[PDB]
């Protein structure tokens, strides 16, 4: 879930499922310019190949 403009506080979304067994939890953060929407090959707004 993205972080638009000057941003700090964001909650989680998905509720309805069965929570069987986990191993751990991990966070991470990446730019929307750096990484495109997955499942296409080429996107117009992806102009950062680094």
């Amino acid at each position: 879930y993205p972080i638009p403009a000057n941003a700090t506080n964001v909650p989680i979304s998905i509720p309805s499922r069965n929570w069987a067994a986990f191993r751990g939890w991990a966070f991470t953060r990446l730019k929307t310019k750096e990484t495109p929407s997955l499942g296409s090959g080429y996107d117009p707004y992806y102009t950062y190949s680094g």
Partner: protein, 64 residues
């Protein structure tokens, strides 16, 4: 122009589902501003009369 207009709408795609939880997250946070920025402003105007009396504590006694 061909690329410039397109970028803004599409990138909010995973955020689309959490529309209800944020419109109401906002309102109560603004109610939190009502008290947190009242108490804070009240501390500034009081300094108004404290420094005004501190003025006349020094200015009247430095003189003698």
């Amino acid at each position: 122009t061909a690329r410039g207009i397109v970028t803004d709408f599409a990138f909010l795609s995973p955020l689309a589902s959490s529309a209800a939880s944020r419109s109401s997250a906002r309102d109560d946070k603004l109610t939190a501003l009502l008290a947190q920025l009242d108490s804070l402003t009240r501390e500034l105007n009081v300094v108004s009369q404290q420094l005004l009396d501190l003025r006349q504590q020094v200015s009247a006694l430095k003189a003698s």
